[PDB]
């Protein structure tokens, strides 16, 4: 047997109130906040890559080799 990333909960009682709960989070992006007030942005681009926004990426993969979650704002000229 093999357990990986397993949340387990068990409870037992006779009389009363019993609560059992389990939660799991894998590759989760939570709570991203961004505020821009009275911001001046001047961009001149000639053949390049410019990123000024908000990017939130969450990736979960099984048996995946060589995977890329995020690739933001790049110039690639491989030969």
Binding residues for ligand A1BGB (CB under 6 A)? 63-65, 67, 70, 72, 75, 77
Residues in contact with a second copy, counted by CB under 8 A, come to a total of 79
Nearest to 28 by CA among 57, 6, 7: 57
Please report how close the Cβ of residue 47 comes to a second copy at its closest, in angstroms.
5
Structure tokens at 68: 């890329």
For residue 10, say whether it is annotated as part of any ligand binding site. Answer: no
Q: Which residue has the tokens 């979960």?
A: 60
Distance in Å, CB of 76 to a second copy, minimum:
5
Residues 4 to 23: which contact a second copy by CB under 8 A?
4-23
Smallest separation, CB 58 to a second copy (Å): 5
Contacts of 13 (CB under 8 A, 6+ apart): none
- Given a contact cutoff of 8 angstroms between Cβ atoms, the answer to whether 57 and 69 are in contact is yes
């Amino acid at each position: 047997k093999t357990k990986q990333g397993v949340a387990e909960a068990a409870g037992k009682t006779k009389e009363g109130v019993l609560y059992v709960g389990s939660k799991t989070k894998e590759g989760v992006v939570h709570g991203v906040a961004t505020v821009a007030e009275k911001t001046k942005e001047q961009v001149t681009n000639v053949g390049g890559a410019v990123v000024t926004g908000v990017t939130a990426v969450a990736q979960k993969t099984v048996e995946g080799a060589g995977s890329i979650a995020a690739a933001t704002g790049f110039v690639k000229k491989d030969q």
